[PDB]
Amino acid sequence: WXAXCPA
Amino acid sequence: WXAXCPA
Amino acid sequence: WXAXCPA
Amino acid sequence: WXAXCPA
Amino acid sequence: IAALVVDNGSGMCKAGFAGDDAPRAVFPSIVGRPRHQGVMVGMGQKDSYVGDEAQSKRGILTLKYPIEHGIVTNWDDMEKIWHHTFYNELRVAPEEHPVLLTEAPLNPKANREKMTQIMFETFNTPAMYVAIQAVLSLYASGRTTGIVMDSGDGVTHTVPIYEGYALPHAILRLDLAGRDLTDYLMKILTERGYSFTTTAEREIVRDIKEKLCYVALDFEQEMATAASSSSLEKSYELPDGQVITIGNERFRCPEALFQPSFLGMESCGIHETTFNSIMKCDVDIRKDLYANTVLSGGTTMYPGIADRMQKEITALAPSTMKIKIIAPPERKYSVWIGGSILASLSTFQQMWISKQEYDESGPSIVHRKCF
Amino acid sequence: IAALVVDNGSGMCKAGFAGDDAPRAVFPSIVGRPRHQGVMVGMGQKDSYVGDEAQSKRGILTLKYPIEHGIVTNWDDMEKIWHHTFYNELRVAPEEHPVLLTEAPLNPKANREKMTQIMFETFNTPAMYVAIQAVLSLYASGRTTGIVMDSGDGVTHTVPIYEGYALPHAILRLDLAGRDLTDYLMKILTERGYSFTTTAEREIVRDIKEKLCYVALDFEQEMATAASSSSLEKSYELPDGQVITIGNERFRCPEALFQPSFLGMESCGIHETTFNSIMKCDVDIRKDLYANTVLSGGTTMYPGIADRMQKEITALAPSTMKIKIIAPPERKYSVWIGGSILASLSTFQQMWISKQEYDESGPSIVHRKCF
Amino acid sequence: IAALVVDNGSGMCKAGFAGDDAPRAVFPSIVGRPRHQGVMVGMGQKDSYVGDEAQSKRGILTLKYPIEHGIVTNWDDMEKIWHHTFYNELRVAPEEHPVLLTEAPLNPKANREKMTQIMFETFNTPAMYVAIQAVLSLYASGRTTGIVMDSGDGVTHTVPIYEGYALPHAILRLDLAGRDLTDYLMKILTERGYSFTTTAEREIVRDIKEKLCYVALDFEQEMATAASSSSLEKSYELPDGQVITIGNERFRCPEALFQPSFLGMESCGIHETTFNSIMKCDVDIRKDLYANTVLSGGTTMYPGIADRMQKEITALAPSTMKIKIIAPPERKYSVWIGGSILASLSTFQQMWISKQEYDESGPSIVHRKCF
Amino acid sequence: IAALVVDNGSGMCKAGFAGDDAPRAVFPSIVGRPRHQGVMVGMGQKDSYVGDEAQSKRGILTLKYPIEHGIVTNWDDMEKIWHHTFYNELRVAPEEHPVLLTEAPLNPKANREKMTQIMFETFNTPAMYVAIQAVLSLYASGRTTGIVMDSGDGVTHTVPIYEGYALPHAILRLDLAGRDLTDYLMKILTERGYSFTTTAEREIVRDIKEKLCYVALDFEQEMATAASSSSLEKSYELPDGQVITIGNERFRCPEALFQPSFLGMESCGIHETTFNSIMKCDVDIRKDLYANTVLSGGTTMYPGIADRMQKEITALAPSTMKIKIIAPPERKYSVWIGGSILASLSTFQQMWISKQEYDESGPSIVHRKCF
Amino acid sequence: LKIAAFNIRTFGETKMSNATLASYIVRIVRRYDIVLIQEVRDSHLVAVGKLLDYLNQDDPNTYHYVVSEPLGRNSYKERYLFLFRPNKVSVLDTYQYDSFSREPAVVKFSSHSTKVKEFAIVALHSAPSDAVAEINSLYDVYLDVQQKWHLNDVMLMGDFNADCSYVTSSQWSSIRLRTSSTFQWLIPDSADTTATSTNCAYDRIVVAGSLLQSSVVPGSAAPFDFQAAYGLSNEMALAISDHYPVEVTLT
Amino acid sequence: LKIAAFNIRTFGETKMSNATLASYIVRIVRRYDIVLIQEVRDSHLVAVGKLLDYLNQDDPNTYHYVVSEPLGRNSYKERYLFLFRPNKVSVLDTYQYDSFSREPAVVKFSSHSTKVKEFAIVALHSAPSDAVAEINSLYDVYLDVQQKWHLNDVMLMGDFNADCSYVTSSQWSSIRLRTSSTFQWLIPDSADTTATSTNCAYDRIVVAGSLLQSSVVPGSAAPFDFQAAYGLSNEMALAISDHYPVEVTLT
Ligand SMILES: Nc1ncnc2c1ncn2[C@@H]1O[C@H](COP(=O)(O)OP(=O)(O)O)[C@@H](O)[C@H]1O
Ligand SMILES: [Mg+2]
Ligand SMILES: [Mg+2]
Ligand SMILES: [Mg+2]
Ligand SMILES: [Mg+2]
Ligand SMILES: [Mg+2]
Ligand SMILES: [Mg+2]
Ligand SMILES: [Mg+2]
């Protein structure tokens, strides 16, 4: 992703 | 209607 | 609540 | 260990 | 020969031919438009649903009632339902044979003018006639003398008829009816602990009202009994499988018919309106109205309404009076039966308004030859 | 002497003494329990945290709101909040002086019955009274006529009052509120590329809304501005040090109040609801109601909410109408301010509900001697 | 002429032609670069290995998944795997016929935008379209109503559909999936006494997951048998040559879906998410949604998953309701099969996004013309 | 009744009373069997030399480490190491007072299972407890929040703890440790010209590592100074009398911790595995863990290690983050020092596994009660 | 330019479990800029990556790998390896065989340092029970190289399983390489090319092309006795492999 | 049965770095059943492990070792290394005696081949400065072992560093060894017991006990000139040690 999850 | 009630 | 909404 | 590592 | 008769009342609508003893096309007058996009493209679907189609799939559609308080509001939507009943339901072209229309009294002038124009222009029907719904109820019961109690979905009205000669100075129109009763049941059911705010849930409330609600002879006494006993309680099954419990709300809602102040309406109760209507008439005929009091409309189906009706009138009326309440079965469809009998009558055939009269004089003829 | 006032509700709770100019005890109404096994011996930490304790350590606890949409759902966790505010925060014994409570209009009757039982059994307070959160806002603004909009965390309600005599039939309740806005902001932020899943980050989303979100005067033209510019993008600092940039979501989130179709809610918008509430009232009083429309609640703390509503009402309302929106500062604590003033009034000493009255008639007395 | 249905999910990729009943090209979505410089015999410096070639030469190559929870983190590698699946496996130039892509719902908006830009420039396909993976699952079953449970390798989501109308507010996405189960199995097997840390070793663990683990009907009941019975033990052979024994570790890994607290996720179970998905919908469509539940995704091939899910939902849902879990065979390829049916439909021809539309309106056309 | 706390780890083993500030019995955990039949003057360990005695005679004996990567392999050899610890070194009967043991996280169940059996059968200790090595490190530092970096001789692991709630899913374990560094230093020295093959020579290389090796922050450039200057070259004399010179090998050996690819291990570096553990934590607890980082273990007193890791982390971490590396003096006994503090605590007494509890539930209680 | 053909025995992950044995192999390979490794039973290329992990640890561009497909369906899936330094020599073109259980592989290097700029290398480890076939077979294969690549000099090694009763007097003349003067044999039968004490000249270094003959250093072609050179015993020598490296020096 | 004493000059890792010298020392030690080793500079027992490895490489129980903890009073500490064949003689008991830089040790031996059954071995490498002072105390040690261990025959022999100006005629009468005829001196003084050309008889042979004096074969006490016996030169012999082994035979 870009904040929360590792992605 | 046109004044009183909602119709 | 008890029926409608989740509460 | 018992598989992966040597121990 | 054959004549179409269609009950244009709010909520449930009735249709059929002249001479039949029961309408065939009965469906709510609701129209829904989807409020979600169609992700599935397998079928083309439709942007409008009328009649049982909207009732079958009322989960997604946004229900709207074209007829409110016995008034057509959205003429664009109002014409759509007439297409559905003529073609999809009855499979009969309006041009082949005439049609009969019904409406509530004291309607605004513009309503009659545009309703006739739609018949002449869109459906090019050779001849039609608009009649007071309460007047037709007398023909259904056979008697031509008495006071009629029509309590429809939107408007409850009274009109006295004494061997004919309908009195125009004693008609009282009350906007409290079953539609506002359901809205009142909407609020009181919140107190028990259930919410039905959305429009789709609003139709569930009407089903509960038509099944469990009943009229209590003595409102104050039943309040004490219900507050200390579960005998008055009855259960119900929602579409999703949940079970609700109804207590004093079972009979509080139908009791609002006699206490409009519970709904904030300054108007007096329907029992007092019926008493007031007779008072406006001359004393010579007042004895006749008490003997013949017929009941009509869907909101008369509550059990015990006839017994409560005669109890209140007895109080206001003097002693040694013949307080007779006539509540025949099928009175919910009594207006349709009365129209069917009237259309089958041969004398009334000369009273129709024809197309040639309309073109020569315009829509204003609805107020000279049509009553 | 001085009576406690507690505007118990979803989100922040305000408690304080009578006559105080501002509540001294504000804290989120959050009860959480750990979701991991204790590993440190001698830590001394308890197994339940409320108020500021849960907020500081929200990365471990599973936060749960006892109050949802205005109805208490978990009395086990709910009672802890009341025990904490009286003892750990207010540092006062509740059994010495009366306690005043507030609740939203149109609430289940079971909610009030259990609220009374807790006061008179768990805490044994000498006197208690529950008041509508809508009527308390008038006393804060020093007015007697007008409509209020106590848009809180759980429920948005409007109650028109005309020199007293609050109309029961015109009370409108809408489930849309600040808490549901956060859930929408949770979903719409996923499109940009930020994901928040657990309850711990739900509080983070709330802080973002309180610092950046605002209401645009116009909606259609506002999206065009963000399409060809970046001036509307503001940077924010996450607790972990990461930097997040908010695009057009700054104004889209508060827009769900005026267009409930964003959340799929079929009910009308917040501006349409007030118009509906006014029309239910009589015509003779509509002139006064239009002028006096005071706001309340933290959900109306967005900048520009005053001008946007005035445009919406003015277009809906007939012209040449003095449409004034009263949104004074400190209105975030409007409900508590009125309660403090009203409790200090000498007339309130007559309609207190003492423990003797509760004993003789049970919890049902709260529906008769109290509105 | 035809349509290229491509499902670039995580773990595996399916490609084929429209109208076929089964994909013709299935291979792991793994791209590897040469760790050490060198050349192949009889060939040039390939510089990249995609799919089964990568696993064959995993010793001298790195292993990296371009997809993590349905998000394209790197685009240089995604360009390679698309290049491999068009020329080296399908053996057809994409410039002749349009293609169709699939994506997870609630994905970042930047993910879809780059998909359009790459394909309309690198491959220059005449037309392109993007569809939700869950929506395409319903087409394979041939139904029009019912919720869709798409538990893929990286993302698990539910998309309730009623009569072809989606409910965007009812979409719930869970990051727990098959990949997280594989990582969880490493820690569980560590307790037994086997250590797996190598990326190439991770594939061997996944092979154990697909053949031995099963979901039981109860935790405590069956785990009691495991602690006192060797019948549940099943021997497995690693490619290295050794033989291991799996006992009670067989059932804990596939059942983490129902209790996500084992991995530390605060999100509720997969059965809870499906139950919460329906509860967000309206009351009238709950009867239909409960009856039609479609299971999809690779992580749904565990034996006994249908019975466990039905048991969990039955307890939560009210009684006297026909709960049915539809788990047909060939459900692993349900997503691709639906794409072939949708592409072959003539009605879908008016939904392709052409080059003319893309050029004038820019890459952002996929947000309005497409879902 | 005291509380015996013994580290029982790889390499050096610590044993001492509870409440003491420093261990008393410190000696390598090396046991050896006499390769040669002959015995010497008044010789008492004919079965096997145990402890530092085998170190003084490693030329005749053959050295075997009972602990490899933190798991017991030779249970018969372990029974000697404890018997030597309790009797000839600590000089007390273990049956008089209970003993506390430590174990690395993510250990096979068989290691803990047989640990309970030996203590309650061979030594008949009144009670026993097992504590994670990482957890006890925080107790010595006196803090309750932060991560633990225990880099021992056989295993290196990170166990983040937040306010006494350790996170099971964030525990990471790396097999590379101090023992592997010694092997790497032996291999590079062979190319230099000095070949070491015997177990005695392996020990000598370890002594060289503990005295000369150090960590350079500018490793990518230090080898230029090493290749262009002899200042970095230091000479350490060997026991045989040959003085060897260590040049660029002085700092290359400690670099294997940050670059595991030098040893062929594909796992991430020691600086990277700390960041990965934090990345698996919650967002709101991310800020606190950065401030509190505790370094422990015997492979940590390398000069300049704190500076190198602090510089490495601040590159990966977002800016404006206070990264503090807390490295208390005398960190070689942090694991044991923390054990003494926890043992002396009165609250910890209730967590001991009494002998009576072992009898009823067997050895299976070692996981029900302990971590 | 030191070129050798080292016939490792059972090259796989099994020999990678030991670390000391792999250390010696690292020492051997560094001696030769171009070295041929045969009989590598690795199938997933796990073992070959371990070499380049050690060989290229000093610098990534220190060696390059040239490996063949698992053409050896017989028992183990062995593959040939062409370990060469990239900055001494560069690979230009190569192809597989185009009669053998193990198909031969041919590569071409651009040796700028030596006088021979272009040359071809043929690697072939053969079946011990079928020695007669390939040796005459590759002679026809030699002729094809001179026209499809137009290279005059072509370099031959491999494990031909020669001598030690594998080939007799009757079939010695059957070898076209012996009859033809161009394919001179550098390795005499007297030299021992196996780690065992028994004399066995299994491998045969063959140099073809007139310009190549002047390029080879006279007397340089000799088996490598890594056992004595590194001070090792017989068991550790057999632990690595049963064969001795056979080098050649190019000037 | 054969007994001999060999003093190794600075026995430490510096000596077995050479391999030729390591080959030599195995030869002499195999020639006798009981060998006495002194001047063991080894501290970590590295040397003894390698030394007996060549002795037990084939049969694990050809020789058995007894080693003393370093008893050197000064910085230089030596060990009493013993090597004996278990089949011929077995160790019964050991004793470390309580005047000397390194205190002596005594052990019991069961020699079934010889007429005597139990005899006590006393070994001591004397301090060159205090050779006269320490040898007198050995008489008390001789008095020690005859009742506490109750051995009639005790064998005392080692490097006492006598003669060559270390012990003159006046100091010869000072010691009690020559005074009492119960213990008799064997190794001739004229004979040279050192690897050097100088005739220095540093090793002294002392025999006590009536039964053991009958067991010793007359004329069997003579230095072992390994320089001449093995045909080695002087500098090769000096590398092994600066002394010559002394051997006695008991029948
Ligand atoms: N069985 C029933 N019991 C009670 N009320 C009913 C029943 N059936 C219908 N109603 C009420 O009657 C209303 C309309 O009925 P009806 O009079 O037939 O329609 P219209 O108003 O068109 O004449 C509905 O709003 C409904 O609430
Ligand atoms: Mg009607
Ligand atoms: Mg509020
Ligand atoms: Mg998928
Ligand atoms: Mg340790
Ligand atoms: Mg071989
Ligand atoms: Mg030969
Ligand atoms: Mg002399």
Author numbering:
A (entry chain I), B (entry chain G), C (entry chain H), D (entry chain J): 1 to 7
E (entry chain A), F (entry chain B), G (entry chain C), H (entry chain D): 5 to 375
I (entry chain E), J (entry chain F): 1 to 98, 108 to 260
The authors write:
Actin is an abundant and highly conserved protein that controls the shape and movement of all eukaryotic cells. Monomeric actin (G-actin) can polymerize into filaments (F-actin), which form a polar, double-stranded helix with a right-handed twist. F-actin exhibits two non-equivalent ends, known as the ‘barbed’ and ‘pointed’ ends. In contrast, both F-actin polymerization and disassembly are substantially slower at the SD2- and SD4-exposing pointed end of the filament.
We therefore developed a protocol in which we formed short β,γ-actin filaments in the presence of DNase I and phalloidin. The structure revealed that two DNase I molecules can simultaneously bind to the F-actin pointed end, with one DNase I predominantly interacting with the P1 and the other with the P0 subunit. After isolating the particles that gave rise to the most different arrangements, we reconstructed two structures of the F-actin–DNase I complex at a resolution of ~3.8 Å, which we define as conformers 1 and 2. A comparison between the two conformers reveals that the position of the DNase I molecules on the pointed end can vary up to ~10 Å, with changes in binding angle up to ~10°. In both reconstructions, the conformation of actin subunits at the pointed end is highly similar to that in the phalloidin-stabilized pointed end structure without DNase I with both terminal subunits remaining in a phalloidin-induced flattened conformation. The main binding interface consists of a beta sheet-like arrangement with several hydrogen bond interactions between the backbones of the F-actin D-loop (aa 41 to 45) and residues 65 to 67 of DNase I. This interface is further strengthened by hydrophobic side chain interactions of D-loop residues V43, V45, M44 and M47 with surrounding residues from DNase I, which include L45, V48, Y65, V66, V67, F82, V91, V94 and V116. We only noticed the loss of a minor DNase I-actin interaction, which is present in G-actin bound structures but not at the pointed end: Due to rearrangements in actin upon flattening, there are no interactions between actin SD4-residues T203 and E207 with the DNase I residues E13 and H44. However, the main interaction interfaces are retained, which supports the previous finding that DNase I displays similar affinities towards both G-actin and the F-actin pointed end.
